């Protein structure tokens, strides 16, 4: 159970911190992959003993022997020491285990929920008492005084002598420069990205992989002879540089759009979503594999189908984070909800939050307040989307049906075009917001105003627009807002 993963990915202080988010998310995911695979190597177990290696956590089934517990204690101590010696408090892996039996696995006497209940209890107990006394003493003993600090990750240890930059953070910069749509990843003694246990990772492609080594590929070419392990993540990037892809779009405002979503109640549907009479270890395995398979593989293929201007930072049910052109974020959110509902047969709900920002907005504040619009959507954990602000909370069906037929109608009949007709559009938007400040003298003014503004657009007003503008609908002002945001310089 890796802790502080969002704090590792989004809390980076760089001016060019947007180019390293995929590198940091990749680093954490493949870090957990290699840690689990290394433990399975130490226990002489196959990779079939991974039930789920996911975003931030892994689950292993392994034998209840004293030799196994000895290897587990040594592995936990070495992993803890390596994580302290690189990421002081900012990253922690909690290795907790419980004793389960075969009648307990088979749900013969109940207790199959109790496996993961005991495991979550022991993992939270390990997270509560994170360190020992000696580790805290060595943390406080290594503090020095120095007049230097990294630009991005802002630590003063492991700085390079030639430039004020943390070594691991610079290695993330290098691998961000060397991450493509086809790069496989190789872990060996020499490499770019520092890893346990005395190994480093290069992210090299492709003929340099003729090299002792473990090779991690997103997609495998040949199964048998080529002999590498297939590890998938939601690594869709459109252009891997935000200024150029923001300069590519030309119709709307030049703002960056952030989508943060999660499935509603992973934990509840994961421990007590299945009925008790159908519980099995294989059914938990196939549910976890189905959800991860959807998010990673299917989200990559839907994004590559219609080439959206979207960079994916994190993919998974528990947390999702994509960023790109805000028009393509708004276009892909509805099709993400639709295809998730097609995958899960409407048995699971997804709550999203959109946010629009400049490119030079701070990335940590960006992710943090996109997450606070996320929890504003989760207040309403239902079908809910917050469109760029915490007060503009909709549902998915309202957004889909009402907002898109309203936007299509507005883009149809508002494309006359006219020059002062746009001034009329902003005028009516501002006074609809003025009566949205809840004064009915303003709606008396608007009753006077409709008599002024029948003839400005012509006769296309009094078929659908007047029925939407009956009593200051929030749907109409949001559709007009996204229309005038989609139509600028």
């Amino acid at each position: 159970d890796m802790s502080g993963v969002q704090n590792f990915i989004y809390n980076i202080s760089g001016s060019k911190a947007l180019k390293s988010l995929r590198a940091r998310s990749f680093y954490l995911d493949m870090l957990l992959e290699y840690i689990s695979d290394n433990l399975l190597e130490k226990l002489e177990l196959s990779r079939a003993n991974i039930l789920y290696v996911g975003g931030g956590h892994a689950y292993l089934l392994l034998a209840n022997t004293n030799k196994t517990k000895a290897i587990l204690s040594d592995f936990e101590h070495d992993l803890k020491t390596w994580f302290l010696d690189k990421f002081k408090i900012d990253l922690y892996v909690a290795m907790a285990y419980t004793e389960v039996s075969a009648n307990d696995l088979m749900n013969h006497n109940g207790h199959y929920r109790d496996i993961y209940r005991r495991l979550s209890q022991k993992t939270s107990a390990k997270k509560a008492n994170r360190y020992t006394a000696e580790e805290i003493l060595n943390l406080n003993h290594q503090g020095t005084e120095n007049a230097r600090e990294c630009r991005e990750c802002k630590r003063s240890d492991l700085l390079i002598e030639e430039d004020d930059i943390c070594e691991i953070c610079d290695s993330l910069q290098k691998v961000s420069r060397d991450l493509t749509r086809e790069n496989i990843f190789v872990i060996a003694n020499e490499g770019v990205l520092d890893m346990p246990f005395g190994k480093k990772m290069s992210a090299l492609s492709y003929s340099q992989a003729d090299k002792e080594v473990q090779i991690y590929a997103k997609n495998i070419s040949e199964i048998g002879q080529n002999l590498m392990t297939r590890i998938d993540m939601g690594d869709y990037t459109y252009r891997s540089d935000f200024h150029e892809m923001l300069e590519e779009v030309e119709v709307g405002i030049n703002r960056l759009g952030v989508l943060r979503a999660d499935v509603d109640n992973l934990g509840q549907a994961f421990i007590n979503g299945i009925p008790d009479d159908y519980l099995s270890i294989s059914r938990t395995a196939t549910f976890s594999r189905a959800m991860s398979r959807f998010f990673k593989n299917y989200l990559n293929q839907l994004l590559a189908e219609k080439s959206y201007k979207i960079n994916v930072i994190y993919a998974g049910g528990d947390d999702l984070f994509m960023i790109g052109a805000w028009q393509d974020i708004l276009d892909f959110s509805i099709v993400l909800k639709q295809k998730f509902a097609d995958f899960t047969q409407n048995k699971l709900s997804i709550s999203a939050g959109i946010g629009m920002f400049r490119e030079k907005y701070p990335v940590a504040r960006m992710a943090s307040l996109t997450g606070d619009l996320e929890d504003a959507a989760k207040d309403y954990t239902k079908n809910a989307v917050t469109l760029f602000d915490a007060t503009n909370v909709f549902s998915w069906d309202t957004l889909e049906n009402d907002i898109f037929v309203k936007l299509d109608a507005i883009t149809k009949n508002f494309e006359k075009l006219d020059e002062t007709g746009k001034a009329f559009i902003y005028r009516l938007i501002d006074l609809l917001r003025g009566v949205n400040e809840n004064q009915q003298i303003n709606i008396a003014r608007l009753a006077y105003t409709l008599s002024r503004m029948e003839e400005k657009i012509g006769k296309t007003f009094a078929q659908e627009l007047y029925n939407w503008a009956n009593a200051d609908r929030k749907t109409l002002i949001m559709a007009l807002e996204i229309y005038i945001l989609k139509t600028r310089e």
Binding site: I89, A128, G143, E145, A147, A364
Partner: protein, 282 residues
Amino acid sequence: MKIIKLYFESPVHFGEKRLSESKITFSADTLFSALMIEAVGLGKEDEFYQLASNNLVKFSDAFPFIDQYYYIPKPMFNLKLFKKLLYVPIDSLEDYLSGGLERESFNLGKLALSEKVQQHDFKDSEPYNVGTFTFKENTGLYVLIEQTHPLLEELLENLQYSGIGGKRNSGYGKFKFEILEDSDIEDLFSAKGNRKILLSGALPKDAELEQALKNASYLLERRGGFVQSDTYATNLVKKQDLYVFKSGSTFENSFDGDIYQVGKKGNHPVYKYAKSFFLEVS
């Protein structure tokens, strides 16, 4: 035991590693450093450190308050059987612990971001951005003290017209303070209990750390930064990183911390208040 309610008249900035990011409240390190700077302004830092080291003044981290309701961080209890909850009121802790008990929403204000530039005459100007936090109209922060001293009040009044937090000379941080001795909070603090909740960013000394970590649910917090003075080392320099427990932590054994020295290679010492402040519950 007394209170120091801080009613703010301005946006604050209480950054953690940033200028662009801020938190809703500050800690005992920052208030001790601010009072020490106001003591060296009026030449009483030898008296103030001798008061603070001998436990004549003992103040917690600053904590939120909305209308007649004093808040503390959600204590990390290691109970067996509200993840978005972060602050539970201090009086409601007994019936928060006795069952799964949400009565009213917690709203203090909201964060902001100021957009500023560094203007140049014959060059393109440099944008930068300061993350702030504006309190609501009848909210603020409070600090718990006991056995108050006239030096503490003099230093607080001097800090009142100087600023708390970061970017204080550039528009932020002004407040007013009031003592307002309460009866319910002091009766809540005088009562003993089997389990004690930490309330300041403390770190036990090296001969009591093992005793402190017995049945403990803690969270370490890196508390460092740059030295703010003029007479230290004739250039900007980062103090020693000190990892203290976070203020919401909860312990079985008691301890008293220390005012650790994080600056040694300079003309004057630099101190870090990691003394312990506890609240007993059952």
